[PDB]
Amino acid sequence: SLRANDAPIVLLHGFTGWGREEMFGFKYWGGVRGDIEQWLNDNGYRTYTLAVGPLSSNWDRACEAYAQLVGGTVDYGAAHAAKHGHARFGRTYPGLLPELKRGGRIHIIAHSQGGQTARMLVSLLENGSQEEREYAKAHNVSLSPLFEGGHHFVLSVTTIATPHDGTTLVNMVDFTDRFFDLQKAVLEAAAVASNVPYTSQVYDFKLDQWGLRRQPGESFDHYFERLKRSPVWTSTDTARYDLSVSGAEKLNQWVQASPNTYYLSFSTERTYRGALTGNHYPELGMNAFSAVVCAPFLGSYRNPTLGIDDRWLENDGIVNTVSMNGPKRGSSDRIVPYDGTLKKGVWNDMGTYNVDHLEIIGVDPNPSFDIRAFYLRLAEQLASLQP
Ligand SMILES: [Ca+2]
Ligand SMILES: [Cl-]
Ligand code: NA
Ligand SMILES: [Zn+2]
């Protein structure tokens, strides 16, 4: 399909994720398969990568993404900061694409919770925050342009394995310990140990607002024990909260689709249905961590109070497949099956792929998944979108 726009692509990770210089160069986008950003750039599709707080709230991450894109000091909003008890200002970025302030636009390709963050960035650009606007007026403090509303620079948002309606994983017994074991498993995939006090940061959680950071002589094991008991794990202003079924619905109540943006969703599944009661089990090849620690629960957990039934059992090892095609719980967004023509202001359900949560970004191997072809095909589709 002929190119219709020249907007660059911007990659955005989920509740794990790090910059290109982090993890000694092992890429979140590509993992053991390679470097996805490089493949796209080498094929004529200008691509950049964002790195935001993996455990931080989608709100915090959207503010971080904004500053990283246009340049400047991250501003979480005076009202938000005061309400949750963290710094109003975060780190300062040079800006990957300052041209966005003069008419330039982008295509955001997001994985996992990155999909929620991308949606929220669009919502904030379009409508800003009334609470922040009122607070700035009443307290005589500055206001970030992000909260003014009336802005637009995202041509499309593509989500891959995103928990738009949350994931029941959060309801597991011992979630807390298993979630950080997942972080350790991803570190191991990148050939990084969790019992070594590395002097270089290696994996920066970017918790400047909370005043948290791995200390000199501190291992990831020790650091994660502290994070478990910190506000980034115990507050409502967290990825943890937004990841839950309840929290995702809350997010859906205000984060809606913009009529000026194309939305694409890719779903993932890596399970088979059993013959006993219809529960779902991990297929051969699923990354070891998910197969042993998460999939069994995801494919068997039901919760009447939450409306979690049979349709929620199929999963990709981390997120329930039904949650991925687009926001539905507490959402007025429209979702339509891809019909050959991508449409604006609605979710274009691109289908379900037989790849697990980590395989889809290359962090876990899967020879049968042509990952390079998948992303190049996507880049071409995005480039074909009419502005
Ligand atoms: Ca695999
Ligand atoms: Cl600290
Ligand atoms: Na994830
Ligand atoms: Zn916050």
**Which residues are placed with Cβ below 5 angstroms of ligand 4, an ion?**
60, 237
Give the domain range for residue 332: 1-387
Query: Resolution (in Å) of the shown entry?
Result: 1.5
Whether 365 has a binding-site annotation, put simply, is yes
Number of Cβ within 10 Å of residue 124's Cβ equals 24
Question: Are 313 and 279 a contacting pair, CB within 8 Å?
Answer: yes
Supply the residues annotated as catalytic.
112, 316, 357
Q: Mind giving me the DSSP string for 112-131?
A: TTHHHHHHHHHHHHHH--HH
The span from the CA of 153 to the CA of 346, in Å, is 17
Nearby residues of 368 by Cβ (< 8 Å), 6 or more positions away: none
Compute, in angstroms, the gap from residue 58 CA to the centroid of ligand 4.
8
Compute, in angstroms, the gap from residue 196 CA to the centroid of ligand 3.
24
Compute, in angstroms, the gap from residue 153 CA to the centroid of ligand 1.
36
Number of domains making up the chain: 1
Compute, in angstroms, the gap from residue 27 CA to the centroid of ligand 4.
26
Compute, in angstroms, the gap from residue 276 CA to the centroid of ligand 3.
30
**Which residues are placed with Cβ below 5 angstroms of ligand 1, an ion?**
285, 364, 366
Encode burial over 180-192: b for 16+ CB neighbours within 10 A, e otherwise.
bebbbbbbebbeb
What CATH number has the domain bearing residue 280? 3.40.50.1820
- Nearest ligand by distance to the CA of 367: 1
Indicate if the alpha-carbon torsion angle 63, 68, 74, 75 is positive or negative: negative
Whether 86 has a binding-site annotation, put simply, is yes
